Amino acid sequence: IQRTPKIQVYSRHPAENGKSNFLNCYVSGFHPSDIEVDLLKNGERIEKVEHSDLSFSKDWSFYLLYYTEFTPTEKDEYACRVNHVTLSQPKIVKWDRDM
Amino acid sequence: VTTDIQVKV
Amino acid sequence: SHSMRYFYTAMSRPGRGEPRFIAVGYVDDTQFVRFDSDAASPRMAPRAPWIEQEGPEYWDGETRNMKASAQTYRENLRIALRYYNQSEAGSHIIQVMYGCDVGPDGRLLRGHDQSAYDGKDYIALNEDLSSWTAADTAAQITQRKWEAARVAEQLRAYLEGLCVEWLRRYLENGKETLQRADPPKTHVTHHPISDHEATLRCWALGFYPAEITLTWQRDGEDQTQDTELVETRPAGDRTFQKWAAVVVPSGEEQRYTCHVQHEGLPKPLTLRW
Ligand SMILES: Nc1nc(NC2CC2)c2ncn([C@H]3C=C[C@@H](CO)C3)c2n1
């Protein structure tokens, strides 16, 4: 069976411009396990992004946390870009510091 | 600690 | 009031090498070990501070067990393929979860050993730790083989034995973190979306364990049909986050209260913007 990933983009700590932090993209609820996840800075792929070890939930769907160090500013935009076999084209979710 | 048990389905 | 769980995933990938095997271990909501067969040099590895003290015989032994289990699961993928008359050109997944729940006294509450094939239930050990539930005819084959080979008896001996005992050890070694609830830091934010409406978002941050309830009330009444609840999510520092939001008429914010239940909280919280 296959399931489409849920996506949340958010910071480890409350965002304060000029202060270092971590940008997270949490993908969950998906199946099968192959997935492509990029963090974007103003539309451009961030190179050194790490992720958690693959695990799964009670209903067998998978989840992963992708993350990297960032220092938020007023004008820099961030996003998470996800592709999965259940998706016709990559899905981009923008970072909203209020979410 | 993990289990050592090895079983074939 | 505690559990230890291991999560194994084996994934075939024709054209991309032998099947990949990944194992992770948790005590409660804390990951403490990992194994990935695709690592440059595959080993069981620590993922929580309190497991690092385990000696070389633990790490060497866990690494050997993981390498053996990977091989066994690769074989079981081949067997499942035959049960289901599927092509070798297709990719498939076995997922297996097992482990034990213990009570406050440190004794076994319930043992677990259940699995899925391509994300559907395959076979599960029942609570008696003596019988099986098979979800289809392929798993029914497995079920007969396992009764003949006393597999449930073997699992039961692990679950009643080493599982419970090592869980007890880990909980002692990591008592400062595993037996301490971290209450959420909470606050309400306000975001105008027009001249007539605004969003009230109730935040819970930095809590452990993951279990939590956030609810919005209007005039002391449940707004469940109208609340935007996000899935509890990892902060990345072993703590969790959640928020709940409601859209309210501008000016009527004081009609709304956010209610927070968490184990680290002496009393439930009532918040308002
Ligand atoms: N329910 C279940 N399904 C399995 N495989 C089916 C889905 C193809 C399976 N393989 C091994 N075990 C137990 C034996 C040792 C423990 C760790 O491996 C678990 C299993 N339990």
Author numbering:
A (entry chain B): 1 to 99
B (entry chain C): 1 to 9
C (entry chain A): 2 to 274
Task: Give sentences from the paper.
Advancements in understanding the structural mechanisms responsible for immunopathogenesis of abacavir hypersensitivity syndrome, an autoimmune response following treatment with the HIV drug strongly associated with HLA-B*57:01, allows the abacavir T cell recognition system to serve as a model for assessing which peptide antigens are presented by HLA-B*57:01. The mechanism for abacavir hypersensitivity involves direct binding of the drug to the very strongly associated HLA molecule HLA-B*57:01. Solved structures of peptides bound to HLA-B*57:01 in the presence of abacavir illustrate that the drug forms peptide/HLA-B*57:01 interactions by direct H bonds and van der Waals contacts with both elements. Since the structures of peptides complexed to abacavir and HLA-B*57:01 assume conformations similar to peptides bound to other class I HLA molecules, abacavir reactive T cells presumably recognize a surface motif comprised of peptide and HLA-B*57:01.
We solved the structure of a peptide, corresponding to human transcription elongation factor SPT5 isoform A, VTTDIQVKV, 976–984, complexed to abacavir and HLA-B*57:01. SPT5a 976–984 binds HLA-B*57:01 with high affinity in the presence of abacavir (Kd approximately 0.2 nM, compared to 7.3 μM in the absence of abacavir) and stimulates T cells from patients with abacavir hypersensitivity syndrome. When complexed with 4 different peptides and HLA-B*57:01, abacavir adopts the same docking conformation with the cyclopropyl group occupying the F pocket and abacavir N atoms forming hydrogen bonds with Ser116 and Asp114, residues unique to HLA-B*57:01. The solved structure demonstrates that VTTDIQVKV SPT5a 976–984 has the expected anchor residues at P2 (Thr) and P9 (Val) with side chains buried and inaccessible to solvent. The peptide side chains in the core of the peptide that are most solvent exposed (and available for TCR recognition) are P4 (Asp, 105.4 Å2) and P8 (Lys, 130.4 Å2) in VTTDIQVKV SPT5a 976–984, Figure 1B. The side chain atoms at P4 and P8 of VTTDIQVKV SPT5a exhibit the highest B factors in the peptide, indicating the flexibility of the solvent-exposed side chains free to engage the TCR. These data suggest a mechanism in which drug-responsive T cells recognize a complex of abacavir bound to both peptide and the HLA, where the drug is sequestered in the antigen-binding cleft and TCRs contact HLA-B*57:01 and solvent exposed self peptide side chains. HLA-B*57:01 exhibited a preference for bulky hydrophobic side chains in anchor residue P9, however, short aliphatic side chains, such as valine, were preferred at P9 in the presence of abacavir. However, the TCR BeS-B7 transfectant could be activated by abacavir and also by VTQQAQVRL, corresponding to HSV1/2 230–238.
